[PDB]
Symmetry: D2
Subunit: 510 residues, 4 copies
């Protein structure tokens, strides 16, 4: 279980493990590659032989880090910064950046040692400033550059000491090679896409539970229908729903509102949009974005702009927009569930113990989700279109906004993780109460389709509610703190717990 950079193109899943799970990294030993990295550096070195002095050109690279140390706001997540580093390294491996393998290694060291430089959320228009923080740390330039050494705050100089590493001095091109690029916004992005694909799957699971709690038909997902409107996204969603409801006893076998009957058609564009995004982010992830680019094969460098993260800004905008759609569609399901007029017989607000009259059930939980869903649509607004044309002395008359747009999508995913918790809770309670209305007991497992049983049980495990035919998930209002179950399911989903593993089969289907 070790990730090797340089040989094969990195995938989103690779970046996540290394960033989130602490996985180990190893730079390929391929001579071809190492020779390309060394070849690009000599080109720069040879450029100093002919003719801008080595000493002046190195001071320039170093003073660069200094005026760029103007980040503000909260700090990025340690996983976001780790992913950025991984991508920076991966980039310099194509050997067109003219950077010292020794530096391409300083990263491998920090990554495997658990050192993560601190980075602010504000500072990039789409990643000079942010990368200037990562760089300053790597080379131990000064104590003002703080980092996170496996748990506590240290300064870069102290970290290098403890790593038995010697501060470094930026060479001719190395500053631009380090701080010119889209590695941080693209790293923040890879993490969002991942999380998004997860929530998506869970989303699919939540509707599955909902449809069973509503006793809706499965006819809506018959292939013929979707083979007449062959959008690959719709095709995929209908199919995954047909299977998720396989051998179900809570679903009628063969009237249903559009949130159920048009589910595939609705989810379709989002499923397709999310794959498009993924594919585009992977390409950014394996691109060379510093400047200028060294073409060793023709002994010449070019001055272009692969440092504009347009794909990340546009891509993250869309993603927040799909999140907002997913959530509003879910909120509509809950709406039907809580209403006796539309839930097809379920108790109002999925109340559990009708015996006690004070019980209100999940009415408070719905209001809570009613306050989150709009916010998600609010975050569905774009930012790439609001770029400042006067930026950086008018030289950056166009910019991507990729960095903040990425951070915005991270704020959405986080909120949507909370939202999913609330949804999961509604579906677990619904299938229990549906089971009881049909069989007389609250053991949903005896009637749920096998595919949704895994998710069902995964959630009860996480909240700490023990499967029993004598009682449903929520019985009385005074018997639990709903807020605790929200936080627990959130943390689970965020850490990749049992609930996530439960949707493993859907996330890989994409």
């Amino acid at each position: 279980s070790i990730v090797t950079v340089g040989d094969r193109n990195l995938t989103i899943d690779e970046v996540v493990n290394v960033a989130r799970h602490g996985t180990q990294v190893r730079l390929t030993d391929n001579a071809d590659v190492i020779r390309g990295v060394q070849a690009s550096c000599d080109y720069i070195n040879n450029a100093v032989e002919t003719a801008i002095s080595r000493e002046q050109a190195a001071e320039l690279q170093t003073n660069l880090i200094w005026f760029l140390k103007s980040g503000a706001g909260n700090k990025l997540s340690l996983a976001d910064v780790r992913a950025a580093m991984l991508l920076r390294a991966n980039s310099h491996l194509y050997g067109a950046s003219g950077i010292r393998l020794e530096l391409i290694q300083r990263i491998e060291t920090f990554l495997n040692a658990g050192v993560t430089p601190h980075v602010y959320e504000f500072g990039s228009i789409g990643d000079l400033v942010p990368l200037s923080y990562i760089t300053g740390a790597l080379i131990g330039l000064d104590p003002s550059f703080t980092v996170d050494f496996d748990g506590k705050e240290m300064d870069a100089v102290t970290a290098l000491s403890r790593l038995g590493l010697p501060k470094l001095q930026l060479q001719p091109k190395e500053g631009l090679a380090m701080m010119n690029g889209t590695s941080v916004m693209t790293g923040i992005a890879a993490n969002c896409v991942y999380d998004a694909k997860v929530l998506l799957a869970l989303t699919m699971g939540v509707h599955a539970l909902a449809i069973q709690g509503l006793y809706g038909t499965n006819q809506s997902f018959h292939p013929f229908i979707h083979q007449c409107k062959p959008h690959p996204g719709q095709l995929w969603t209908a199919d995954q729903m047909f299977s998720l409801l396989k051998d179900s006893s809570l679903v009628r076998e063969e009237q249903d509102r559009y949130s159920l009957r048009c589910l595939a058609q609705f989810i379709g564009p989002i499923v397709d949009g999310v794959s498009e995004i993924t594919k585009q982010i992977e390409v950014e992830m394996n691109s060379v974005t510093d400047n200028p680019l060294i073409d060793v094969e023709n002994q010449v460098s070019y001055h272009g702009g692969n440092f504009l993260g347009q794909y990340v800004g546009v891509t993250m905008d869309r993603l927040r927009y799909y999140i907002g759609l997913l959530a509003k569609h879910i909120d509509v399901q809950i709406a039907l569930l809580v209403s006796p007029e539309f839930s097809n017989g379920l108790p109002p607000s999925l109340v559990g113990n009708s015996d006690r009259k004070v019980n209100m059930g999940l009415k408070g939980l719905q209001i809570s989700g009613n306050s989150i869903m709009p916010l998600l649509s609010f975050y569905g607004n774009s930012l790439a279109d609001r770029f400042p044309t006067h930026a950086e002395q008018f030289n950056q008359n166009i910019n991507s906004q990729g960095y903040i747009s990425a951070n915005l999508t991270r704020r959405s995913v986080d909120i949507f993780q909370n939202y999913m918790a609330i949804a999961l809770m509604f579906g677990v309670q619904a299938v229990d109460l549906r089971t009881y209305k049909m069989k007389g007991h609250y053991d949903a497992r005896t009637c749920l389709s096998p595919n949704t049983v895994q998710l069902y049980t995964a959630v009860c495990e996480v909240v700490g509610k023990p499967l029993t035919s004598v009682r449903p998930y929520i019985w009385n209002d005074n018997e639990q703190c709903l807020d605790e179950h929200i936080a627990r399911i959130s943390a689970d989903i965020a850490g990749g717990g049992l609930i996530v593993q439960a949707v493993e089969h859907i996330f890989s289907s994409l």
Copy 2:
């Protein structure tokens, strides 16, 4: 030059010709197909044999048209309605709608006779109401249904007479088959995508002219750069720019602002997004969207929801968003052009006759474009996320907003056609004044790259300005009405004139 429906899947280009150019239509004679259409109808007929009475079930289909005649607002464009019809027909040809070939023909007749039923812009949430207007006309149900008979307003009953056609009476399933679907929003959509691909190409041409008026380098578009960040969209744009500047004398051969240096990276996502859209719209265009769907092969019908135009609403949202991006990027180019501080030597506001001191040049034309560009970004806001959850007695708790979203994108394309006119004007004046600064004469053709020469001359032809080395496009302020040239270039672009033909080579490159 005749379009045949039923045999091969329709393409955007096919729908445009038939809708915009009046091209002729012909339903394939393939027995397999015709048999499928007849087979689906017998299934319905046989359903009345067993068991809801023929007379009651036909009155139902007819009363359907009546309560649905509640459209409001302005009328759709005759081409939008023609495209809708074409798509309706094309749909019933898969033979899963259980509709009479005689009706699938009533369309072919209207299309080839130049009859276009009137349709309101308001009425669909994503196309019952709109299709109810097309239907009512086809069958001559009543005089209240007005149409456009090759030039003037007639009523449907009169139109059928003059066509020697007999009013028709809706059979069992035929109402739903006609009025249940996404043909109108998908028809409005196909027309936008088309126009968008055109404006895009022109956009590429306008930057080409701009870059030459600015004497910018072509190094920014060298393949190496873009092969290090291989986004297919970026790859395509850089390449098309490298060629568009081929053998140019106004461009320096090898500092440039980002609007020039990052042009490919910026345009990239938009070029890729627009192809994704196109592909998705073509799939909607060749889908069966009425309901229920008749599966003759297994003698059974299904009740689903391929009538949700989610792909059209999501797709059109994105498109308006790309239009807004394109335009704001263009406005930034103009900005550099008009400013002596950034234009690299050009006269302020591209004034022509410096001799006369009252001349202000294109300063008024820039302010005009400055008022349009923001509006385009404003239209870049979405609508698919604002769908009403309480719609149609709460049964349509989810809807696409495809119809209005489509109309919104039509309003954008229209405005952006005006905007492009203003841009083209700026680039024509710029290259003339750049030529004079370098050569001493105003004959840009002697220095423009061959690829941009075609577009260059196409615009001068349209505005009526005669190529001469003794004077530039705009000389004095009192010698022309800029508003006239805007309208002329707009109309040209909208009708597919010389200017469009000039970008033929770029539109087909996609």
Copy 3:
């Protein structure tokens, strides 16, 4: 009935009559005023005596009109242009613009003669270009300047002839005095505020009808409640609702959803916001916005920027935002009406003739309103925040977007006029069907509160439905074209017909 400019500050109502109703204008004869206008001109004249030559400074003023003739897009409404003119005149009357009374009169002449110069919708960033069109026409500068002479298209030169007027030649400062300002966007604005105040009142009437069709209580509007939360807007709305329901038999006397119980609290901010706007627009309307400003009293001119219509852009943004709120609140009322589960006994979709089973009632009309309401919220997005910082050679690094923002609010009002028609229709049908459920007959007038009776009857008059206890407004689906009634009620509301007069008592209450 004659409006006199110069003596008292113009009010919105004054501008509307003159613009919409063709009312006559008369410049006050107050010597003080006329002396101020003449005094400001001598200051300019005297500035040429001392020292920029009279001939050169007049050519400048004239060439100004020429490069500014670059408008694009559709044409403004004749009433919008008439209001602009009225405001231009009114402005030059404070006598700080240094303009010839003869010109301040050329307007009075065009206004009273029914001459309206043509003006494009695109061209201003917030009104040089637009005013350049009005100016060019006034002085008959050239035939390219078209106008509207009481019915048909004439050119300015021909219009001046027929008016027995002599083309004029712009003096020293007169160009800037004419074309520098916020008269056109502020004129478009005054017309919107007006219309908005109307729709608002009607809105109040529509809820009144709705509440009675729903048999809701009037207790929600008891003063105590609103005197505990004394927002003047809420106070006003509750009160106007208490009265609008006075002596009603369809309302229960003393459970209700929030759309009824929180109506005042909801409408409150909108009522207050709309008054704030009005007040702010009136102040723009009576301001001097050309530049520079001549201070005759201290013999000195100042160079400032009262030409930034920030209040109009900000104000119109808000207004579209309030329109979107109003409409979405209305759509929620309709939702309850159409649903038997929430309408309190009404037939589903307010169907009229239950005898006939094919009848679906207003189900198609609701879907139509369901497609308009979202669009209104879509138009609720802002534009003032999207101003281009690079505009006009970077000199207008800040601008109001007032002009387009104004046009956008005009597009909203227009659509919302259509929407109100659909709402009015729902409430008329609802009270009829409520009456029948309570009394056994369909004569709502026998039970409606006197205040809503006027509006009720005003709508039936407009659609052409005759009051009878034997039948409701909509009986069968095949007996009328709902689209016709929408258009008729719209036109009525837009022209200020019977329906508007019916809400006279509410519009003046503000």
Copy 4:
């Protein structure tokens, strides 16, 4: 220095001191008032005498707190919760809520003891859930209710013990009286308005510095101009600018871009909008919002909806929108400053030590502000228009979104505090470098207008830069961490430090 609730209406400034500064509270001793509170309770008590049992009606009030404990997301700020409490109390003092003075006192105790119940950011649609957390804590209902006892986390039961308080049991109406209202969103709101008025003033100070760094004229702010366009907001801004530049040597005495020449006209609507808001928030702050309302004077209760915080949701929306405008206008100033072409002679990017060639100056600081400003406009989007119509079993078909909208405005203010820090830094450096260009030394105090001198020095004090004519604020790039100065100035502004006191004279002018 003690705040007394009940006698006079609370003002924003009152709520801030108590919430932010820990000020002491004291309930008035006015017999009239206390009698009104006691009178409303007897009405409820007497309602149990006649007739729903005391025991059942108290269990209901208690079970209410339980199902409402479903908050999610991060926790509100201790000051936001303190303000909410203060407002809750203040409300029950009008004596129309039928609540026990003993409870109205439990707040006074928590406020003065420094106890602050924990509250989640998610849960209200506009404040049942949030207030349910405050309530549960007050009465020590259970340990799950955590609080903040002067520094560390305790549970409510433990807090009541240490306060020598006896858990309480909710009486007949008391639950609704506590948890039905707009105190939390209105408390979060009062804090934002305050902060906003502060940033505004500072904004005025930052332009003052900017205008002097640019050597712009003060003529733009001459009263005549603004007395011709008498918008009270514009009038106020011009005046405050005329004074802020009083006796200045860095400003030319009498060409300027619009960001300077139209500053008053631009800022005007924002200044007026912010006062409107303030006034509206104060009215919410002193309103009774629980339900039903007890009218002791007529012995009757009413069921209405003063619990809809429409004014807060609408008001906060606008405020974020004004923040976005302010910031984008500021960013445009900085743009001019950093550019030698537009700064009127200043060094590019306000570099300090031109001797050293590696120095880049504030170029990195501008890019940082370039990434924040767009985000602020992004937050300028609304939320009140996106309310969910299906909320709470369709009973809350309309809602304000006040709570989240309030939280959103809090996120804006926070970011804008960071932004202002970056702006202040630019203006301090600019006036130093302007002084040197004019006088030969870097002691700006010798030339700055007295009014801006206070702010100037307040910022240098905060960053720790000592006034000296031998060096400017930023000399070399390697001599300071710009990020440190951003954070320091932010914290200062947020805590109300020297910098804020420096604008005291402007904040009170409103």
